[PDB]
């Protein structure tokens, strides 16, 4: 806890905090009340965690598929957004932090990987993952890798497992059936496949994270990662021209990664909520706030405030971004997401290792997830 009259607000390392502090302190400059920012380790998990006991953020941040099992576990308080201000931000965004009809947080961005190359290396990069062996045996021959990205965190393989049909939950009536699972079907075995031949042909490491993956391209060493706009600043920061443009394709289908929305939740245990409501809607969902912190860390393609959206809706990287996002498809945000990432979070570092093979992973998490 803490007390009314302050408030402190959670959001993911790889989003620009430092930016969202800038907004916090037009807030402290205008009514006193301190903003804190703080950025934990497994936020995704250490949120509920704390916020079980009664502790945490008044505000949490992290893209809307969370939420859902959030406000599940009575962690989060509904919003109530008027009409008008409802027409301030996209529909879609809104339908991204509605569970059962009520909202239950406030959309900001939208989030979708892009395929990011070097220009110096690839002033053509490859339009098909099919082509990816051969143009790394050319790189490999000059001391260089054609592609690396983070294989630790689902998030990041699924849009090529979805390409040619993978899916998490399959959507009808209005609703998604949390039994129908396109976790282990043909074309989510397809697109692991190629991932687990690349790795054991060695045009991968199935070791490969984050950390890890950033590095070798802004150091020039591979030609091509994937990954969203948050991290387009620190390539910033390196001599390294590069390029973001549209994922290749699988079987000559789009990669489909799953979109996500960056989102601001008012913990349950609000003792100032209303003071949040004022935050988010008046100071952060303005065009100022937002520039406020996009500055910092771009915040991707698509924002949730429509006047803001015009202003940046023109630029190579955005426009890669809105293009991935609409070959992909919004995440759900129902609870059993988490027993979704958890699964194929195993299943294709197990893949990838070896510990099992494709089949056996994907068979496994949609046992699991369905369990
Ligand atoms: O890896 C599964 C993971 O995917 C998404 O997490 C993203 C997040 O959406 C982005 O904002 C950024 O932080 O990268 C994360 C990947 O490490 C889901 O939102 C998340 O729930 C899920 O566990």
């Given at each position: 806890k803490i007390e009314e009259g302050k408030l402190v607000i959670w959001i993911n390392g790889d989003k620009g905090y430092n930016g969202l502090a800038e907004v916090g302190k037009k807030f402290e400059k205008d009514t006193g009340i301190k903003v804190t920012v703080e950025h934990p380790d497994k936020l995704e998990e250490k949120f509920p965690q704390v916020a079980a006991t009664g502790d945490g953020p008044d505000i949490i941040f992290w893209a809307h598929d969370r939420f859902g099992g959030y406000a599940q576990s009575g962690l989060l308080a509904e919003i109530t957004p008027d009409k008008a201000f409802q027409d301030k931000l996209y529909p879609f965004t809104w339908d991204a932090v509605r569970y059962n009809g009520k909202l239950i947080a406030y959309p900001i961005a939208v989030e979708a990987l892009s395929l990011i190359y070097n220009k110096d290396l690839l002033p053509n990069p490859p339009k098909t993952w099919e082509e990816i062996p051969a143009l790394d045996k050319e790189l490999k021959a000059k001391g260089k890798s054609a592609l690396m990205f983070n294989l630790q965190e689902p998030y990041f393989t699924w849009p090529l497992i979805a390409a040619d049909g993978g899916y998490a939950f399959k959507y009808e009536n209005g609703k998604y059936?949390?039994?129908?699972?396109?976790?282990?079907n043909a074309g989510a075995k397809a697109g692991l496949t190629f991932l687990v031949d690349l790795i054991k042909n060695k045009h991968m490491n199935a070791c490969t994270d984050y950390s890890i993956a950033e590095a070798a391209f802004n150091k020039g060493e591979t030609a091509m990662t994937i990954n969203g706009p948050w991290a387009w600043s620190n390539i910033d920061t390196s001599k390294v021209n590069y390029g973001v443009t549209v994922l290749p394709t699988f079987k000559g289908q789009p990669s489909k990664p799953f979109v996500g929305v960056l989102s601001a939740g008012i913990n349950a245990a609000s003792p100032n909520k209303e003071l949040a409501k004022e935050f988010l809607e008046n100071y952060l969902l303005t065009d100022e706030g937002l520039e406020a912190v996009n500055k910092d860390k771009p915040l991707g393609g698509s924002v949730a405030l429509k006047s803001y959206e015009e202003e940046l809706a023109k630029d190579c990287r955005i426009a890669a971004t809105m293009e991935n996002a609409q070959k992909g498809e919004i995440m759900p945000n129902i609870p059993q997401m988490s027993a979704f990432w958890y699964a194929v979070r195993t299943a294709v570092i197990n893949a990838a290792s070896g510990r099992q093979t494709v089949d056996e992973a994907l068979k496994d998490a949609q046992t699991r997830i369905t369990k």
């Open positions: 059936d949390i039994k129908d699972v396109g976790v282990d």
